Each structure stands twice: as C-alpha cells, then as structure tokens.
Amino acid sequence: ESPLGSDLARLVRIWRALIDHRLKPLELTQTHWVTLHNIHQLPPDQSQIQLAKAIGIEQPSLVRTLDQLEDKGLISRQTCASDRRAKRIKLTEKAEPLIAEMEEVIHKTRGEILAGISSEEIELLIKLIAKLEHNIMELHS
Amino acid sequence: SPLGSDLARLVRIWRALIDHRLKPLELTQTHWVTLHNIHQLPPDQSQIQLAKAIGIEQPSLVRTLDQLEDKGLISRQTCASDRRAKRIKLTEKAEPLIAEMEEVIHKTRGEILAGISSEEIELLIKLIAKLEHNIMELHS
DNA sequence: AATAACTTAGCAAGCTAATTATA
DNA sequence: TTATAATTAGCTTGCTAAGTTAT
Secondary structure: OOOHHHHHHHHHHHHHHHHHHHHHHHOOOHHHHHHHHHHOOOOOOEOHHHHHHHHOOOHHHHHHHHHHHHOOOOEEEEEOOOOOOOEEEEEOOOHHHHHHHHHHHHHHHHHHHOOOOOHHHHHHHHHHHHHHHHHHHHHOO | OOHHHHHHHHHHHHHHHHHHHHHHHOOOHHHHHHHHHHOOOOOOEOHHHHHHHHOOOHHHHHHHHHHHHOOOOEEEEEOOOOOOOEEEEEOOOHHHHHHHHHHHHHHHHHHHOOOOOHHHHHHHHHHHHHHHHHHHHHOO
C-alpha cells in the first residue's frame, strides 16, 4: 500500500528546511514568514486570538512568534481599548522593507517547487488538501 | 493559495489523530512509523539504513529507538562485520502490538480518505513525490 | 590522520494545561 | 460568578553540531 501520512509528514519537513534556508539571509524563519504574511493580509488591528485562528495555530504558538518579531521591531502590541484584555497587532514601519523582499524569495521558490504541475493539478491538489483537513476536523468530534 | 501552510496544518492534525487512535496502545505515530519500517525491511538493518528509509536524521531515530527499546519492542545488537553499527531487530513482544496497530492505521487510513477516487489518490501520491522532488533539488 | 556510525546535547516550533487580568 | 485574551511552563519530535568508538 502507500505510507501517505508519513510521506506528507516528510514533505512538509523538507519544505520547511528549504524556506528556512532561503530566508536565513533575512534573519527570518518560515515560522516568521507565515505570521507576517498573515498580518499583512488581514484587516489591521487584529487581536492575537483572531490572528492565531487565521494562521491555524493555538495562541501560545503565536505568542512565542510575536515575541520574536517584537524583538526585531517588526510588530507592535497595543492593548485593545474596548477590551483591555486583548492586543492590536500591527506591523511597524521597519516591516514593509523586509516584506517585499520576503514575499519574493517565497514567490520565487513557490514556482521552483511547483515545477511541472498543471494549474489544474494544483487547484485539484489544493481541493484534496482542504478535503482531507475536512474529514479529520470532523472525526475530532 | 497558502498551500505550504495548508499542508503544514494538515500533517499536524493528521498526527494528532493517529497519536490519539494509538494512545490506547501506549504508542505514538512516531513509534508506528519506526516499527512499520522495521517490519518491512530486510531484517538486520543498521540504524543509518533504517533512518534513511524512514526519511529522518539518525539522531531523530536514536530517541525513538531508545523509547521502543525501553518497551522491549526492539533490540540493538552490535554488527559483527562493522563493530561501529547495530542490528535493529523486533522482539517477540512486538508482533502482538503490530497486528493490532496496522489495523487502527488501516481503519483510519480509510476513514481519512473518504470520498477520493483511487485515481485522485494515486495522482495525489504522484504530486507529493514530485513536490518532494523539486525541493530535494533546490537543496543543491 | 580521516571518515563513519551511533550517541549526546541543545535548538525549533507545534501543542496542552494552568496563570493572570479584564469583561 | 464565570468566562475570555494573553501569557507562562513544560511536552514532543523534528533538527544540527559536537563527542565517542571503531574502520
């Protein structure tokens, strides 16, 4: 038969290794990219919880990442006036310079990774991924 | 489309699931993958061989073996030809857990792949191998 | 002297449970 | 009271770099 579960596992692992590598010259990690990509793509002034839910990671995972970005002056936490419990995640000015460059390395690489795949074979793949994630999300209950 | 993170998230929950469906066997997905692989290779593998098979660095495999060894599920015997290496062999206590195990798996693999033409599968499996391919090249 | 197999130590980034402060 | 956002503390299992023994 076919070890598809571990084969995906291994795919993601090396895919990470690659992105991690193509970013090292920017002092960045895949894990940073994913968080930044997501801020720069949501209605500004998100709460962390919102952002977390967007990215698909529990809030603690997101905490560590924000902490790191904050110590590189790439993000800002400001307490939510309406809900003094929450925080507004906003990008800094120092951020847009790293983003342009970044989304390129990515873009560049996304192409290099998807070499030889009909945009249909892609959209299909993308369908199945969402479907698999679907079935699993159900057996959770 | 955020395909890189979407795969990331897929694997993560898929792991969570298998991890769960095994907890009653005291096992982890990570254990399954190592055991599945021994019970599928010419007996008397070196760890390095086994590692290369599984697709993990040798240290990763060290920790896992250590755990299986403290559950008496595997054996390390030093290679006579190369006193540097070790022969990984399953114990007798092992076959009982394996049958049960490969079932939970089998059972679940079916439940996970609900509604996918065996072609859509084989295709998926093609693309996976292809993506892994392109990446493995940009490594050089 | 160099390389190799396994081990060790410690980092990375997910996660769950538990704390703290505010609604 | 009770529940909710952000955090902290600690597990897991991958990694890489450095150590040990044997080739």
